[PDB]
Ligand binder design. Structure first.
Ligand SMILES: Nc1ncnc2c1ncn2[C@@H]1O[C@H](COP(=O)(O)OP(=O)(O)OP(=O)(O)O)[C@@H](O)[C@H]1O
Ligand SMILES: [Mg+2]
Lengths: 170, 105, 529, 57, 49
């Protein structure tokens, strides 16, 4: 009941995507959701915007990537890698909902600067954020401002007056 | 015999007559070795006991008692802002010393 | 229940190879299949069929327990190709090409499969960050790509591939496990100690979770050295078919050709050019056409290949070298004249290309690499000149030389940490500094944020400390309205603070102690950055 | 076979990977000399700082 | 004055601040964890004084 989709080789393509999105929402660790994209794509069902946003929801709302913990987890980077897989690779383009999921995480992560990048990028794409998140970004900014946490501390300390391979930390 | 001619049936040929020859092994003290239709089945003590023994040998080689088993994986520190506000410039040094102690001490 | 089928007895054995004598006449053996040789009542020596003859005899490649082989031993036949275990359970292991694990201190996959046909593979769209600026900018490597690494002995052939394996790790811990690129390091004919050091390197940087190592040392049989890279690609099969990504690193393929020569000549095949049998092109063709970026119908998986070929006296006229340049898309030519001449990695850009180009690399890297190509094409024409117009030097003669300094590395560089060093060059912010301080600059540009220190913080977000701007840079690009002005209002302050506080102090040094101290600092900056 | 390894570790005839030191908790998690292991249980810093061992065993 | 109150609260319960459960699972030997804990206290003392 929709415009039939085609691959780059003009082959007809499946659209019956619902049964896979449910497997994303039923997930508990947000690495299995990507695997659902894989098992979906093998079946000649390529992902659509709704599916990627389901994955960004499951990312934002899940606790950890895998059952065991992992060093180097960044809840933001996975979400912002899906958008590169979306825009460039697959040709699909995100929407206001997608960037909304993205900005919520930077609020939760407390990283107030990357938020402002997202705030500007939205409106450069016509998207408009929810002020509930914009104000929380500014709140985290003001807190980190007054507290001296505006930057990390290791940047706000003097450098070696004398050149020495050890002092600079290399 | 039963196994012999049953193996002869499983072969692609069975119309050919079957001639049986029985010989003696000093190496084998239990079981037999049978060849029919260029198909051999070995059920001998030298083979069976060594087959069961191989499992024990492999299991012994796998284990390393001298070694220490790996600990559970550790997540990122994610230190709180209150810690950092108390100790701005020091947490980096302390994490480095923690790595040093985890390796040496 | 399970009766093994016998086909003949061992007739002859010449080192790594053997000749079978068939028992009966109506018995028939297949081709390329594995056979077994009852070296004892307990153990079995695997093998492989390489010839069949009018006499019924079989030319056989041996792979295990060769020393226990005799003449007259009973020979059995599986009637199946050579296979190995495959799966995610193999990651984090060193493995014999027969699948046997090498200690330290269900599923089966075919070793020889047909390649992805012309419909079952997508063109190259996405990159593979090897970590080096020349290879990310000017020789863009992509996924589903196969790019050779040429070079004379001891030039950095092994290290480019290892650094690729080490660059991917940080990302893979951040991104999902579908877009992470795993790795396989195949060591054909190498020394067992080199393999140990590689294992320990990857284990230090924790790149061993996402790497397996297929070891076929020099003492190993030639047939095993022959089928090693097939074992590697055989593991890549599953990650293709499981929609994942994977990287291959075929350490010297020349050593995989000596083994095929050994086999074929000892089995009395006719020699050919440089004593090879002749069909050694088809060998690497079979191996390397298996690389592909698979269609979305097939999971949008991939496997990149970084084959390595040793070179003698910087010639590209040897047989196997030409046979591989013919096959591989691009090539990373490493010149000993440049390795010896100071710069490391010793990439020679005139002879190193990539037949994919912008389509592989990133939106943010397209606009910089397209500038560096123009700049280096212009610097290629002038840099032969000993600089006479010291103040009349063209801007290209400046920017190009500083970019060459930036090309000097030891380890991989993070994407965010690479562009921002190259953007300054192409746009000329790093023109007042001298060549020798081009990397200390970069160090401070990437690891000691000056405006955050000296109070000149007007930028709302753009600072190099966070390290999470890589994803915004990657998506939006640098030539974007939200990122261009903040970028310039970070670098111009970095330049002014450098030129005023640091550069000034540097040129005021006259003593030998202090100048030697400053000397060694810049070499350290060339290594770590 | 493992009890034999334990006895060899207690005697000190065998060594551990990456120069791991012998301790009761260490050993327990792997799995006169025994009394010394009992001393090894207690924290070294606690003993030295508080002089618990100064009085005697 | 907030910073002074925070320093006092931290000195009263240094261990609470750090994740005790995580550290215990992570460290093979309790002694290593103890040493880490001892250093933080001296840092706070030298800071306030
Ligand atoms: N970018 C680099 N910076 C510093 N040192 C390097 C760099 N690249 C290579 N080297 C050094 O060059 C030496 C050899 O590198 P590599 O092991 O890659 O050689 P190779 O190409 O494998 O030659 P061979 O196979 O004959 O060993 C090593 O000491 C290595 O550290
Ligand atoms: Mg090498």
């Amino acid at each position: 009941a929709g415009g039939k989709r085609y691959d780059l080789f003009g082959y007809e393509v499946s659209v019956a995507t619902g049964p896979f999105i449910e497997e994303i929402k039923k997930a508990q660790f947000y690495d299995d959701a990507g695997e659902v994209i894989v098992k979906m794509n093998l079946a000649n069902t390529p992902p659509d915007l709704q599916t990627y946003n389901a994955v960004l929801e499951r990312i934002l709302n899940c606790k950890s990537k895998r059952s065991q913990p992992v060093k180097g987890e960044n809840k933001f980077a996975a979400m912002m890698d899906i958008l590169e897989e979306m825009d460039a690779r697959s040709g699909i383009k995100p929407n206001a909902e997608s960037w909304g999921y993205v900005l919520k995480e930077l609020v939760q992560a407390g990283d107030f600067r990357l938020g402002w990048v997202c705030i500007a990028g939205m409106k450069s794409l016509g998207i408009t954020p929810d002020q509930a998140l914009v104000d929380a970004n500014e709140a985290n900014a003001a807190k980190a401002k007054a507290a001296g946490t505006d930057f990390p501390a290791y940047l706000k300390k003097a450098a070696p007056e004398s050149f020495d391979t050890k002092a600079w930390g290399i | 015999r039963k196994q012999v001619e049953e193996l002869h049936k499983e072969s692609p040929l069975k119309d050919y007559k079957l001639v049986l020859e029985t010989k003696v092994d000093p190496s084998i003290g239990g079981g037999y070795i049978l060849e029919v239709c260029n198909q051999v089945v070995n059920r001998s003590a030298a083979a069976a006991a060594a087959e069961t023994a191989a499992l024990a040998k492999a299991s012994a080689a796998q284990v390393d008692w001298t070694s220490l088993p790996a600990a559970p994986p550790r997540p990122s520190p994610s230190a709180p802002d209150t810690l950092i506000r108390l100790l701005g410039s020091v947490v980096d040094d302390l994490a480095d010393a923690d790595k040093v102690e985890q390796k040496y001490g | 229940l399970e009766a093994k089928q016998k086909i003949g007895f061992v007739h002859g054995i010449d080192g790594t190879i053997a000749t079978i004598a068939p028992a009966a006449s109506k018995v028939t053996v297949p081709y390329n299949t594995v056979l077994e040789i009852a070296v004892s009542a307990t153990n079995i020596a695997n093998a492989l069929v390489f010839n069949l003859e009018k006499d019924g005899s079989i030319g056989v490649i041996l792979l295990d327990n060769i020393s226990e082989v005799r003449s007259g031993q009973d020979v059995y036949a599986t009637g199946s190709l050579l296979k190995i275990p495959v799966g995610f359970h193999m990651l984090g292991k060193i493995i014999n090409p027969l699948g046997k694990e090498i200690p330290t201190g269900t599923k089966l996959g075919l070793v020889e499969e047909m390649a992805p046909n012309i419909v079952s593979r997508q063109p190259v769209n996405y990159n593979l960050l090897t970590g080096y600026k020349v290879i990310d900018t000017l020789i863009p490597v992509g996924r589903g790509q196969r790019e050779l690494i040429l070079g004379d002995r001891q030039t950095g052939k092994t290290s480019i591939a290892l650094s690729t394996i080490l660059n991917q790790t940080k990302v893979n811990n951040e991104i999902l496990s579908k877009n992470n690129v795993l790795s396989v390091y195949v060591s054909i004919g190498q020394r067992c100690s080199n393999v140990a050091r590689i294992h320990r390197l990857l284990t230090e940087y924790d790149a061993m979770k996402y790497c397996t190592i297929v070891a076929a040392t020099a003492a190993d049989p030639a047939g095993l050295q022959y089928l090693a890279p097939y074992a590697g690609t055989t593991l890549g099969e599953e990650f293709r078919n499981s929609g994942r990504h994977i990287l291959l690193v075929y350490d010297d393929l020349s050593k995989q050709a000596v083994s095929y020569r050994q086999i074929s000549l000892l089995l009395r095949r006719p020699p050919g050019r440089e004593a090879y049998p002749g069909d050694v092109f088809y060998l690497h063709s079979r191996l390397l056409e298996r690389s592909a970026m698979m269609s979305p119908q097939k999971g949008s998986g991939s496997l990149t290949s970084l084959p390595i070929v040793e070179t003698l006296s910087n010639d590209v006229t040897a047989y196997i070298v030409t046979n591989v340049i013919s096959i591989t898309d691009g090539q990373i030519y490493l010149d000993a004249k440049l390795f010896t001449g100071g710069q490391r990695p010793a990439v020679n850009i005139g002879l190193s290309v990539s037949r994919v180009g912008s389509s592989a690399q990133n939106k943010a890297m397209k606009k910089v690499g397209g500038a560096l190509k123009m700049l280096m094409g212009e610097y290629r024409k002038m840099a032969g000149e000993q600089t006479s117009g010291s103040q009349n030097v063209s801007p290209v003669m400046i920017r190009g030389a500083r970019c060459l300094q930036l090309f000097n590395q030891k380890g991989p560089s993070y994407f965010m940490d690479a562009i921002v060093a190259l953007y300054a060059v192409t746009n000329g912010y790093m023109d007042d500094v001298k060549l020798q301080y081009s990397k200390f600059y970069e160090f401070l540009l990437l690891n000691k944020d000056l405006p955050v220190l000296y109070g000149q913080v007007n930028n709302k977000y753009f600072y190099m400390y966070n390290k999470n701007l890589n994803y915004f840079i990657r998506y939006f690009g640098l030539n974007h309205e939200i990122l261009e002005p903040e970028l310039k209002k970070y670098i111009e302050i970095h330049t002014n603070l450098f030129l005023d506080n640091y550069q000034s102090r540097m040129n005021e040094l006259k003593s030998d102690e202090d100048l030697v101290q400053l000397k060694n600092l810049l070499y350290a900056c060339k290594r770590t950055v | 076979v493992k009890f034999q390894t334990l006895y060899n570790v207690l005697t000190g005839k065998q060594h551990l990977k990456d120069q791991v030191p012998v301790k009761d908790c260490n050993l327990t998690a792997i799995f006169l000399y025994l009394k010394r292991v009992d001393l090894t249980r207690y924290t070294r810093e606690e003993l030295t700082t508080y002089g618990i061992l100064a009085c005697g065993p | 004055p907030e910073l002074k109150v925070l320093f006092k609260e931290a000195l009263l319960q240094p261990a609470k601040l750090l994740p005790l459960d995580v550290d215990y699972q992570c460290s093979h030997d309790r002694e290593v964890v103890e040493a880490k804990r001892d250093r933080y206290l001296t840092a706070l003392v030298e800071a306030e004084q």
